[PDB]
Amino acid sequence: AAAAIKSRDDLYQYLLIDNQVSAAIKTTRIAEAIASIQLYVNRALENVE
Amino acid sequence: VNALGEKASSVLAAFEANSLTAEQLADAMNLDANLLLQASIQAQNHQHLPPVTPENAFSSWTSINTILQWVNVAQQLNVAPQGVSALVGLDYIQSMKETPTYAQWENAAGVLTAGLNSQQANTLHAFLDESRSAALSTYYIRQVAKAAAAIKSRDDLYQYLLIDNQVSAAIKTTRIAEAIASIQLYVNRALENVE
Amino acid sequence: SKLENYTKVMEMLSTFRPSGATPYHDAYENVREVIQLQDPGLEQLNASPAIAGLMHQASLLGINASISPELFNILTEEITEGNAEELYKKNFGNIEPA
Amino acid sequence: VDPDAVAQHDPMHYKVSTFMRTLDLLIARGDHAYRQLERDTLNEAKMWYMQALHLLGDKPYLPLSTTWSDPRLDRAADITTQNLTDLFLPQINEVMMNYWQTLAQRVYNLRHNLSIDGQP
Amino acid sequence: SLAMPEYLKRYYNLSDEELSQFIGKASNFGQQEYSNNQLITPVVNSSDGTVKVYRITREYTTNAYQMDVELFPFGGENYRLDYKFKNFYNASYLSIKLNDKRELVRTEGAPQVNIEYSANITLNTADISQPFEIGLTRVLPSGSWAYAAAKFTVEEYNQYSFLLKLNKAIRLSRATELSPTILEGIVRSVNLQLDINTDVLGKVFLTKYYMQRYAIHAETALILCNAPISQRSYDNQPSQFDRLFNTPLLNGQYFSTGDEEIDLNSGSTGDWRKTILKRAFNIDDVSLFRLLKITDHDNKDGKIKNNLKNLSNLYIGKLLADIHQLTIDELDLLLIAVGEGKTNLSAISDKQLATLIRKLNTITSWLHTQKWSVFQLFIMTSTSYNKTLT
Amino acid sequence: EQNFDEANRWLKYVWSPSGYIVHGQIQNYQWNVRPLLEDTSWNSDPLDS
């Protein structure tokens, strides 16, 4: 509850993993991890967190 | 006889006797029995030559031909035989008998209109709206317009009432936009001191 | 007007001979348009000679020519010196002939 | 009727003009990456759009019906002529609304494997 | 917290236009009519969008034998007041006040018995915080009056019963992927209270089946489910009744349900009402009488009552033939050939009507596979025989 | 050049049916050019040229 996660987009921003994506799109595991870390850093630098 | 198909064998035998009736012939032609009964009633009421009477209406071939002509005309107009009965009463260009009063005309118009489909009804309604607009505009100019405005024709009435009456029914606009157009036209007329 | 309902208005309008594009008989126009949609030229009427014989032929042909019954009353009557002074009252009312 | 003198009188407006040019840059960068359809680049397109998405923030909710009561034109004329904001409300900037519409639709295509013209 | 529209939209993961068409009607999630003199209702009052539930408690205070009176909010300090008289007094005018004090509306002339009159009055915070009276007054030309009044307590009340109904509505709309307007148009044909339950939930499956199988509109499918035609206009759209019998208006005559009696005899040459029926159904007089005979076997004569139920039965009979691309004649011969034609559609169970629909569909599919006309089937299944020597 | 808004004012200098307003008062004259305002009807004969 300390994270006020209220909907699926909020969960995507929190867990850093896209859950609403369709099953058609396929990506390698390492590239997906890179995307999660980049999104987290971008959120931090703009002081959104 | 060929149109009656397989039933012809019984229909002709019943015709050669004085036996044929509305129901048997209706079953033979795959028509509604009430339709033939009402066509026969309407034929009896109106003066044909030769005359049609209940005791010959299906005994003689001429009476059958007259009844079938009534049925064919009804199905062409896609109306019941009472519609044709109302139509043939509209002998308005003669002196033998009284002219049809407006209620009769309105009744015939309604019965005839009931048979049209949506597309044809849409076209008919557009034509009627245009004609009504012309008649009402002329009557308003003659009889309701205030003489202080020298309204002499339909264009003058358009400039006065600020509403386009000669427009065809095809064009459709929202009410507020139409009100905006009327106010803009009035202001434009005022600024140029045409008024 | 004193008129109160739509059909009474169209009855009044059907005989308003003094105006320049009336008389306008609306039921007749509806009947004529429906016929000219459903059977152009009365091909089926004339193909059925028994029904044709019930009508006066001038009363079928008049539906083609768009002559309404009051417009027929206007076009029919006989103009002469000795009634022009009042048939002008019937057909134009108050507009000065000058 | 000059936008720049009025923005000069109230330089809070210049802040919005800069903000809006930042969103224009982020969207154009995302579209440019999205033009290449290979797998790696579409993930760059996504992170560009998500970057502009949190900058815009929460789309405002706007209650569909309100105090406005369908008045007579005769009444609105007098209510307004007491000497329009006396009776009509200010609308949200239609351009800012459009940024949320185009960003949400673009991410919708990235999530559903369409292209930018929406063709499968 | 869940009362805020933003929180609720995030919670159900709804779209903005999807939420707008739920909460823009939200008053329907209340009680629809007074019960025990109470009305419990959601109200928008939405300077911030939030929903607040009010209990209104009526209390008859003066001359309750004169009238019934009812109050239904729709906005902040904005109300509809409805009232219906029991006794007649020839008012010179009707005057209505907050208590007997601030006159909120006045109506000239005499209010009639058994008419529900209405007024879009206002009642303000300093008013509705009181157990205020509303004093109505038929003032006669003498200055005598049938004054009558009731108090109306306004209370803020718990949102539980509102949120549970909204929950039912959202989950049902999302599961059947049907617009909320359609579902609202279905629920009113079971109950005058908006109450999703086994009965209403039984025919949403039927309407989803018919709309798929026959590709017809929602209202037509509801008619097939033995539901009366809806007079109410949803969605800023003309009502089913209005689109069926009023547009376009025929000779400036407006058609509505009445206590007058309409004749369906083909040879009677009926009034404009018969023309309205013929135009709406796109059928001639003879087939109209045949449809009347198919639908009801207890109508000895062609005259029928002009109430809405008979019109609904006639529309059901017409749609049975329309969906299968047959006209009334083949419909009659088909119903006779099946053997279920003896049963009347006017007095029939819902399950029996569904069974009849399935039988008609199956026999039509079989005839199409066999390249057979309906008349041939009637001949093979006929029992009456012509008594004519050949 | 289809710059109608600017063409209207430029042509309105010489003549304007709406009229001319100066210092907050409407002016009597209709044409802004003096020899057009003063010459109110054609000569008894034109120039042959």
PDB file of all heavy atoms in Angstrom, chain B residues 106-134:
ATOM      1  N   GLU B 106     -58.332  12.544 -49.228  1.00  0.00           N
ATOM      2  CA  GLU B 106     -57.382  12.206 -48.171  1.00  0.00           C
ATOM      3  C   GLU B 106     -57.377  10.719 -47.829  1.00  0.00           C
ATOM      4  O   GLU B 106     -56.310  10.130 -47.613  1.00  0.00           O
ATOM      5  CB  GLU B 106     -57.716  13.014 -46.925  1.00  0.00           C
ATOM      6  CG  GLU B 106     -56.756  12.838 -45.785  1.00  0.00           C
ATOM      7  CD  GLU B 106     -57.155  13.669 -44.580  1.00  0.00           C
ATOM      8  OE1 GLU B 106     -58.333  14.079 -44.510  1.00  0.00           O
ATOM      9  OE2 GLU B 106     -56.297  13.913 -43.703  1.00  0.00           O
ATOM     10  N   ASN B 107     -58.545  10.084 -47.821  1.00  0.00           N
ATOM     11  CA  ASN B 107     -58.606   8.639 -47.618  1.00  0.00           C
ATOM     12  C   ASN B 107     -57.909   7.862 -48.727  1.00  0.00           C
ATOM     13  O   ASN B 107     -57.132   6.936 -48.456  1.00  0.00           O
ATOM     14  CB  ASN B 107     -60.062   8.205 -47.502  1.00  0.00           C
ATOM     15  CG  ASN B 107     -60.208   6.720 -47.336  1.00  0.00           C
ATOM     16  OD1 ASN B 107     -60.610   6.020 -48.263  1.00  0.00           O
ATOM     17  ND2 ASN B 107     -59.880   6.221 -46.151  1.00  0.00           N
ATOM     18  N   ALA B 108     -58.164   8.222 -49.984  1.00  0.00           N
ATOM     19  CA  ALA B 108     -57.465   7.553 -51.077  1.00  0.00           C
ATOM     20  C   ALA B 108     -55.960   7.780 -51.018  1.00  0.00           C
ATOM     21  O   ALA B 108     -55.177   6.850 -51.241  1.00  0.00           O
ATOM     22  CB  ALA B 108     -58.020   8.020 -52.417  1.00  0.00           C
ATOM     23  N   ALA B 109     -55.536   9.011 -50.745  1.00  0.00           N
ATOM     24  CA  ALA B 109     -54.114   9.295 -50.600  1.00  0.00           C
ATOM     25  C   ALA B 109     -53.474   8.428 -49.532  1.00  0.00           C
ATOM     26  O   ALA B 109     -52.393   7.870 -49.744  1.00  0.00           O
ATOM     27  CB  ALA B 109     -53.903  10.770 -50.282  1.00  0.00           C
ATOM     28  N   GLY B 110     -54.142   8.265 -48.391  1.00  0.00           N
ATOM     29  CA  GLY B 110     -53.556   7.464 -47.329  1.00  0.00           C
ATOM     30  C   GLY B 110     -53.477   5.992 -47.684  1.00  0.00           C
ATOM     31  O   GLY B 110     -52.451   5.340 -47.449  1.00  0.00           O
ATOM     32  N   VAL B 111     -54.543   5.452 -48.271  1.00  0.00           N
ATOM     33  CA  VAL B 111     -54.526   4.042 -48.643  1.00  0.00           C
ATOM     34  C   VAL B 111     -53.445   3.773 -49.679  1.00  0.00           C
ATOM     35  O   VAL B 111     -52.715   2.782 -49.587  1.00  0.00           O
ATOM     36  CB  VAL B 111     -55.911   3.598 -49.132  1.00  0.00           C
ATOM     37  CG1 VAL B 111     -55.816   2.243 -49.763  1.00  0.00           C
ATOM     38  CG2 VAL B 111     -56.874   3.558 -47.971  1.00  0.00           C
ATOM     39  N   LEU B 112     -53.312   4.652 -50.674  1.00  0.00           N
ATOM     40  CA  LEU B 112     -52.282   4.465 -51.694  1.00  0.00           C
ATOM     41  C   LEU B 112     -50.882   4.599 -51.112  1.00  0.00           C
ATOM     42  O   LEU B 112     -49.976   3.853 -51.491  1.00  0.00           O
ATOM     43  CB  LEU B 112     -52.469   5.468 -52.826  1.00  0.00           C
ATOM     44  CG  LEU B 112     -53.262   5.027 -54.048  1.00  0.00           C
ATOM     45  CD1 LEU B 112     -52.530   3.908 -54.737  1.00  0.00           C
ATOM     46  CD2 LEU B 112     -54.660   4.606 -53.667  1.00  0.00           C
ATOM     47  N   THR B 113     -50.690   5.532 -50.176  1.00  0.00           N
ATOM     48  CA  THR B 113     -49.371   5.758 -49.593  1.00  0.00           C
ATOM     49  C   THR B 113     -48.944   4.598 -48.710  1.00  0.00           C
ATOM     50  O   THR B 113     -47.746   4.332 -48.575  1.00  0.00           O
ATOM     51  CB  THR B 113     -49.360   7.057 -48.795  1.00  0.00           C
ATOM     52  OG1 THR B 113     -49.880   8.116 -49.602  1.00  0.00           O
ATOM     53  CG2 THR B 113     -47.956   7.409 -48.375  1.00  0.00           C
ATOM     54  N   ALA B 114     -49.898   3.913 -48.088  1.00  0.00           N
ATOM     55  CA  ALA B 114     -49.548   2.834 -47.172  1.00  0.00           C
ATOM     56  C   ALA B 114     -48.765   1.719 -47.856  1.00  0.00           C
ATOM     57  O   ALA B 114     -48.018   0.997 -47.192  1.00  0.00           O
ATOM     58  CB  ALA B 114     -50.807   2.265 -46.532  1.00  0.00           C
ATOM     59  N   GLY B 115     -48.909   1.558 -49.167  1.00  0.00           N
ATOM     60  CA  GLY B 115     -48.251   0.466 -49.866  1.00  0.00           C
ATOM     61  C   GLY B 115     -46.795   0.669 -50.238  1.00  0.00           C
ATOM     62  O   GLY B 115     -46.131  -0.305 -50.599  1.00  0.00           O
ATOM     63  N   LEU B 116     -46.276   1.885 -50.160  1.00  0.00           N
ATOM     64  CA  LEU B 116     -44.921   2.173 -50.600  1.00  0.00           C
ATOM     65  C   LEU B 116     -43.884   1.645 -49.609  1.00  0.00           C
ATOM     66  O   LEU B 116     -44.158   1.456 -48.424  1.00  0.00           O
ATOM     67  CB  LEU B 116     -44.741   3.674 -50.785  1.00  0.00           C
ATOM     68  CG  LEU B 116     -45.331   4.222 -52.071  1.00  0.00           C
ATOM     69  CD1 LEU B 116     -45.272   5.717 -52.054  1.00  0.00           C
ATOM     70  CD2 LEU B 116     -44.564   3.672 -53.241  1.00  0.00           C
ATOM     71  N   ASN B 117     -42.675   1.406 -50.118  1.00  0.00           N
ATOM     72  CA  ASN B 117     -41.546   1.001 -49.293  1.00  0.00           C
ATOM     73  C   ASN B 117     -40.816   2.228 -48.742  1.00  0.00           C
ATOM     74  O   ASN B 117     -41.119   3.369 -49.091  1.00  0.00           O
ATOM     75  CB  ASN B 117     -40.600   0.108 -50.088  1.00  0.00           C
ATOM     76  CG  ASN B 117     -39.943   0.830 -51.232  1.00  0.00           C
ATOM     77  OD1 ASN B 117     -38.982   1.575 -51.042  1.00  0.00           O
ATOM     78  ND2 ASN B 117     -40.460   0.623 -52.433  1.00  0.00           N
ATOM     79  N   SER B 118     -39.831   1.979 -47.873  1.00  0.00           N
ATOM     80  CA  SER B 118     -39.086   3.070 -47.237  1.00  0.00           C
ATOM     81  C   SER B 118     -38.385   3.996 -48.229  1.00  0.00           C
ATOM     82  O   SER B 118     -38.418   5.221 -48.064  1.00  0.00           O
ATOM     83  CB  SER B 118     -38.064   2.485 -46.266  1.00  0.00           C
ATOM     84  OG  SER B 118     -37.202   1.580 -46.934  1.00  0.00           O
ATOM     85  N   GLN B 119     -37.757   3.448 -49.265  1.00  0.00           N
ATOM     86  CA  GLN B 119     -37.037   4.290 -50.219  1.00  0.00           C
ATOM     87  C   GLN B 119     -37.985   5.159 -51.035  1.00  0.00           C
ATOM     88  O   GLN B 119     -37.801   6.383 -51.161  1.00  0.00           O
ATOM     89  CB  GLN B 119     -36.201   3.417 -51.143  1.00  0.00           C
ATOM     90  CG  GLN B 119     -35.311   4.194 -52.077  1.00  0.00           C
ATOM     91  CD  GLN B 119     -34.657   3.297 -53.100  1.00  0.00           C
ATOM     92  OE1 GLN B 119     -34.973   3.364 -54.288  1.00  0.00           O
ATOM     93  NE2 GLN B 119     -33.737   2.453 -52.648  1.00  0.00           N
ATOM     94  N   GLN B 120     -39.046   4.547 -51.540  1.00  0.00           N
ATOM     95  CA  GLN B 120     -40.039   5.284 -52.296  1.00  0.00           C
ATOM     96  C   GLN B 120     -40.813   6.231 -51.399  1.00  0.00           C
ATOM     97  O   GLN B 120     -41.174   7.330 -51.826  1.00  0.00           O
ATOM     98  CB  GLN B 120     -40.969   4.300 -52.993  1.00  0.00           C
ATOM     99  CG  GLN B 120     -40.301   3.540 -54.119  1.00  0.00           C
ATOM    100  CD  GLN B 120     -41.271   2.683 -54.899  1.00  0.00           C
ATOM    101  OE1 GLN B 120     -42.022   1.899 -54.323  1.00  0.00           O
ATOM    102  NE2 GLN B 120     -41.250   2.812 -56.216  1.00  0.00           N
ATOM    103  N   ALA B 121     -41.065   5.843 -50.153  1.00  0.00           N
ATOM    104  CA  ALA B 121     -41.700   6.783 -49.240  1.00  0.00           C
ATOM    105  C   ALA B 121     -40.816   7.999 -49.003  1.00  0.00           C
ATOM    106  O   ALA B 121     -41.313   9.125 -48.929  1.00  0.00           O
ATOM    107  CB  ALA B 121     -42.027   6.102 -47.916  1.00  0.00           C
ATOM    108  N   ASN B 122     -39.507   7.797 -48.878  1.00  0.00           N
ATOM    109  CA  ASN B 122     -38.596   8.922 -48.693  1.00  0.00           C
ATOM    110  C   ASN B 122     -38.635   9.887 -49.873  1.00  0.00           C
ATOM    111  O   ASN B 122     -38.736  11.111 -49.691  1.00  0.00           O
ATOM    112  CB  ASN B 122     -37.179   8.406 -48.470  1.00  0.00           C
ATOM    113  CG  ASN B 122     -37.015   7.745 -47.121  1.00  0.00           C
ATOM    114  OD1 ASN B 122     -37.880   7.862 -46.253  1.00  0.00           O
ATOM    115  ND2 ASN B 122     -35.905   7.040 -46.937  1.00  0.00           N
ATOM    116  N   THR B 123     -38.620   9.354 -51.096  1.00  0.00           N
ATOM    117  CA  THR B 123     -38.734  10.237 -52.259  1.00  0.00           C
ATOM    118  C   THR B 123     -40.088  10.938 -52.340  1.00  0.00           C
ATOM    119  O   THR B 123     -40.156  12.149 -52.617  1.00  0.00           O
ATOM    120  CB  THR B 123     -38.486   9.443 -53.531  1.00  0.00           C
ATOM    121  OG1 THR B 123     -37.156   8.918 -53.508  1.00  0.00           O
ATOM    122  CG2 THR B 123     -38.644  10.329 -54.734  1.00  0.00           C
ATOM    123  N   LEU B 124     -41.170  10.218 -52.066  1.00  0.00           N
ATOM    124  CA  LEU B 124     -42.489  10.838 -52.087  1.00  0.00           C
ATOM    125  C   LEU B 124     -42.593  11.959 -51.066  1.00  0.00           C
ATOM    126  O   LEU B 124     -43.127  13.035 -51.364  1.00  0.00           O
ATOM    127  CB  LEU B 124     -43.565   9.792 -51.824  1.00  0.00           C
ATOM    128  CG  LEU B 124     -44.907  10.380 -51.403  1.00  0.00           C
ATOM    129  CD1 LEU B 124     -45.512  11.136 -52.543  1.00  0.00           C
ATOM    130  CD2 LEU B 124     -45.840   9.300 -50.936  1.00  0.00           C
ATOM    131  N   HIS B 125     -42.072  11.734 -49.862  1.00  0.00           N
ATOM    132  CA  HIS B 125     -42.144  12.745 -48.818  1.00  0.00           C
ATOM    133  C   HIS B 125     -41.319  13.971 -49.173  1.00  0.00           C
ATOM    134  O   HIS B 125     -41.730  15.101 -48.885  1.00  0.00           O
ATOM    135  CB  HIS B 125     -41.705  12.139 -47.494  1.00  0.00           C
ATOM    136  CG  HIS B 125     -42.738  11.243 -46.883  1.00  0.00           C
ATOM    137  ND1 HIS B 125     -44.022  11.663 -46.613  1.00  0.00           N
ATOM    138  CD2 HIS B 125     -42.679   9.948 -46.494  1.00  0.00           C
ATOM    139  CE1 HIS B 125     -44.709  10.664 -46.088  1.00  0.00           C
ATOM    140  NE2 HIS B 125     -43.916   9.612 -46.005  1.00  0.00           N
ATOM    141  N   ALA B 126     -40.171  13.784 -49.818  1.00  0.00           N
ATOM    142  CA  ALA B 126     -39.391  14.948 -50.231  1.00  0.00           C
ATOM    143  C   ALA B 126     -40.164  15.799 -51.236  1.00  0.00           C
ATOM    144  O   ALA B 126     -40.244  17.035 -51.105  1.00  0.00           O
ATOM    145  CB  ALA B 126     -38.058  14.499 -50.823  1.00  0.00           C
ATOM    146  N   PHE B 127     -40.785  15.149 -52.221  1.00  0.00           N
ATOM    147  CA  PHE B 127     -41.564  15.888 -53.215  1.00  0.00           C
ATOM    148  C   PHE B 127     -42.742  16.626 -52.579  1.00  0.00           C
ATOM    149  O   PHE B 127     -43.012  17.796 -52.901  1.00  0.00           O
ATOM    150  CB  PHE B 127     -42.055  14.912 -54.277  1.00  0.00           C
ATOM    151  CG  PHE B 127     -42.863  15.537 -55.364  1.00  0.00           C
ATOM    152  CD1 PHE B 127     -42.250  16.130 -56.443  1.00  0.00           C
ATOM    153  CD2 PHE B 127     -44.240  15.516 -55.318  1.00  0.00           C
ATOM    154  CE1 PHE B 127     -42.996  16.696 -57.453  1.00  0.00           C
ATOM    155  CE2 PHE B 127     -44.989  16.084 -56.324  1.00  0.00           C
ATOM    156  CZ  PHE B 127     -44.366  16.675 -57.391  1.00  0.00           C
ATOM    157  N   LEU B 128     -43.443  15.966 -51.662  1.00  0.00           N
ATOM    158  CA  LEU B 128     -44.563  16.609 -50.986  1.00  0.00           C
ATOM    159  C   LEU B 128     -44.120  17.811 -50.164  1.00  0.00           C
ATOM    160  O   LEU B 128     -44.807  18.839 -50.140  1.00  0.00           O
ATOM    161  CB  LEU B 128     -45.284  15.609 -50.096  1.00  0.00           C
ATOM    162  CG  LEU B 128     -46.248  14.730 -50.869  1.00  0.00           C
ATOM    163  CD1 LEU B 128     -46.978  13.813 -49.918  1.00  0.00           C
ATOM    164  CD2 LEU B 128     -47.203  15.607 -51.627  1.00  0.00           C
ATOM    165  N   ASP B 129     -42.979  17.710 -49.485  1.00  0.00           N
ATOM    166  CA  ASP B 129     -42.510  18.843 -48.694  1.00  0.00           C
ATOM    167  C   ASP B 129     -42.187  20.044 -49.569  1.00  0.00           C
ATOM    168  O   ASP B 129     -42.535  21.180 -49.225  1.00  0.00           O
ATOM    169  CB  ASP B 129     -41.288  18.446 -47.875  1.00  0.00           C
ATOM    170  CG  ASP B 129     -41.657  17.833 -46.545  1.00  0.00           C
ATOM    171  OD1 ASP B 129     -42.838  17.935 -46.155  1.00  0.00           O
ATOM    172  OD2 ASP B 129     -40.769  17.256 -45.885  1.00  0.00           O
ATOM    173  N   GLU B 130     -41.556  19.818 -50.719  1.00  0.00           N
ATOM    174  CA  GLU B 130     -41.267  20.946 -51.602  1.00  0.00           C
ATOM    175  C   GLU B 130     -42.543  21.625 -52.092  1.00  0.00           C
ATOM    176  O   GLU B 130     -42.665  22.862 -52.057  1.00  0.00           O
ATOM    177  CB  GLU B 130     -40.428  20.481 -52.782  1.00  0.00           C
ATOM    178  CG  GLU B 130     -39.052  20.023 -52.392  1.00  0.00           C
ATOM    179  CD  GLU B 130     -38.369  19.277 -53.506  1.00  0.00           C
ATOM    180  OE1 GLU B 130     -38.900  19.289 -54.635  1.00  0.00           O
ATOM    181  OE2 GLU B 130     -37.306  18.673 -53.255  1.00  0.00           O
ATOM    182  N   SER B 131     -43.522  20.832 -52.531  1.00  0.00           N
ATOM    183  CA  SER B 131     -44.765  21.429 -53.016  1.00  0.00           C
ATOM    184  C   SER B 131     -45.498  22.197 -51.919  1.00  0.00           C
ATOM    185  O   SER B 131     -45.992  23.314 -52.150  1.00  0.00           O
ATOM    186  CB  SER B 131     -45.656  20.351 -53.614  1.00  0.00           C
ATOM    187  OG  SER B 131     -45.032  19.782 -54.750  1.00  0.00           O
ATOM    188  N   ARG B 132     -45.554  21.635 -50.714  1.00  0.00           N
ATOM    189  CA  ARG B 132     -46.211  22.327 -49.614  1.00  0.00           C
ATOM    190  C   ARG B 132     -45.520  23.640 -49.306  1.00  0.00           C
ATOM    191  O   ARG B 132     -46.181  24.637 -49.008  1.00  0.00           O
ATOM    192  CB  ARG B 132     -46.221  21.455 -48.370  1.00  0.00           C
ATOM    193  CG  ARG B 132     -47.191  20.329 -48.397  1.00  0.00           C
ATOM    194  CD  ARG B 132     -46.998  19.518 -47.152  1.00  0.00           C
ATOM    195  NE  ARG B 132     -47.813  18.314 -47.124  1.00  0.00           N
ATOM    196  CZ  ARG B 132     -47.737  17.397 -46.172  1.00  0.00           C
ATOM    197  NH1 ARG B 132     -46.894  17.524 -45.160  1.00  0.00           N
ATOM    198  NH2 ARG B 132     -48.532  16.333 -46.227  1.00  0.00           N
ATOM    199  N   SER B 133     -44.191  23.659 -49.353  1.00  0.00           N
ATOM    200  CA  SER B 133     -43.478  24.900 -49.078  1.00  0.00           C
ATOM    201  C   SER B 133     -43.837  25.971 -50.087  1.00  0.00           C
ATOM    202  O   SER B 133     -44.069  27.125 -49.712  1.00  0.00           O
ATOM    203  CB  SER B 133     -41.974  24.664 -49.054  1.00  0.00           C
ATOM    204  OG  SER B 133     -41.633  23.775 -48.005  1.00  0.00           O
ATOM    205  N   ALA B 134     -43.895  25.622 -51.369  1.00  0.00           N
ATOM    206  CA  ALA B 134     -44.276  26.637 -52.352  1.00  0.00           C
ATOM    207  C   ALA B 134     -45.676  27.183 -52.078  1.00  0.00           C
ATOM    208  O   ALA B 134     -45.894  28.407 -52.067  1.00  0.00           O
ATOM    209  CB  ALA B 134     -44.203  26.064 -53.765  1.00  0.00           C
TER     210      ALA B 134
END
